[PDB]
Ligand SMILES: Nc1ncnc2c1ncn2[C@@H]1O[C@H](COP(=O)(O)OP(=O)(O)O)[C@@H](O)[C@H]1O
């Protein structure tokens with residue numbers, strides 16, 4: 001595991017990016033709020049555990065041609081019970097990428 | 105009563121902000137940095153496997169979790 | 176000797192206390208290919224990985240080198256009879272092939288539980304990895320091990336409110352195994368070694384010569400090295416030849432005598448950073464093994 005990349009990168013139209021993530025968010029039944037045209041706070045109910053999870057998406061420019069989608073988990077406030085805040089964040093991000101977005 | 109007028113900033117959000125709050129785009133880790141916490145990192149996709157990763161705090165301890173997940 | 180200083184220390188410290196400031200943790204979704212999963216353990220420099228079940232949304236188990244060992248034995252035998260299932264298996268489907276009626280729920284511990292609870296749990300469940308899971312988050316923070324725990328003990332207990340039992344020998348305290356020692360010879364094939372691993376559930380095998388004297392050690396970890404090859408075929412080779420493909424570590428070399436005091440042995444284990452000592456005689460003939468679990472079981476039951 002050598003090279004770690006922050007978020008994902010795209011050369012799509014920024015507006016096309018934001019509009020599409022919003023479309024994936026609503027299809028997945030998440031709630032969300034638009035803070036900026038490039039910054040979203042999303043919140044999901046766990047269909048299994050009934051717990052809530054929050055994250056932030058922020059769009060950045062790297063090239064004059066290229067943009068980067070950033071994902072940030074937002075913090076809340078013997079056998080294991082169901083649920084993990086960390087894994088569920090990854091799954092959120094994963095669901096969102098799959099549903100808004102295609103590989104080049 | 106006269107018609108009123110509207111001055112719209114418009115190009116306040118012309119383009120996404122430029123990157124670095126010194127947030128690192130790429131981290132190389134071949135066999136700390138303070139606030140890339142809670143942010144998503146990923147390896148290049150290989151043979152239909154995703155590897156997601158982040159660093160979180162519990163009290164004063166930090167764990168970097170890596171998930172290996174098929175697509 | 177003592178209602179131990181050890182006992183008291185273990186009861187008054189939380190599992191959180193042993194966690195390094197910074198650590199990495201590898202997690203596998205149970206729908207991952209086993210072949211990919213084990214390759215990943217190696218890649219990351221890690222010996223164990225928690226397993227996440229997506230449908231249930233919870234941790235369900237652990238994938239260790241012992242599993243990699245069970246899987247490889249089954250693969251080698253199955254192949255000889257033309258059954259090529261396992262390598263395209265998913266962790267799930269193999270956990271479905273093994274567990275069946277035999278229940279193995281994941282055992283974990285809170286960062287707020289005692290170290291004594293942690294040592295009891297490892298011993299009772301006959302296990303080498305103990306995930307520390309935050310009951311508030313559901314997050315796995317760290318994987319606890321004997322080697323870790325012994326180091327912490329040696330480090331943070333003063334030397335000299337010293338129990339009498341620290342001056343007594345392995346013989347008088349009866350610590351270690353002195354019968355039915357699973358062993359291999361210089362020329363033993365790796366696939367025979369595996370067979371021994373699967374049957375005796377032991378983590379390393381002493382390598383002996385014709386008079387039964389110890390010349391090396393062959394280990395289960397030496398097995399996940401069979402995950403560097405992108406072929407799997409190399410299995411018929413002698414244990415010697417396989418330890419040439421070695422990179423580093425070293426054990427095997429770590430001998431002790433029946434009459435060394437517990438203090439000397441603890442010091443040697445912690446300093447050398449090794450998982451067991453090969454108990455030996457005047458002439459290097461193996462007589463037993465003394466491993467980290469032996470020692471932790473000893474310290475938790477107040478010497479003995
Ligand atoms: N905390 C745990 N809960 C449930 N099962 C476990 C746990 N840790 C290990 N196991 C399982 O028990 C078996 C023994 O492995 P173990 O001896 O603990 O580790 P290793 O094989 O690395 O020495 C393995 O099949 C492993 O998957």
Ligand SMILES: Nc1ncnc2c1ncn2[C@@H]1O[C@H](COP(=O)(O)O)[C@@H](O)[C@H]1O
Pocket residue numbers: 351352354355356357358376377378379380381450451464465466467468469
């Ligand atoms: N090669 C071996 N043969 C017989 N017993 C062993 C061997 N290695 C370890 N043991 C014993 O098995 C138990 C667990 O071993 P370990 O895998 O070293 O934690 C301990 O009581 C050891 O003394």
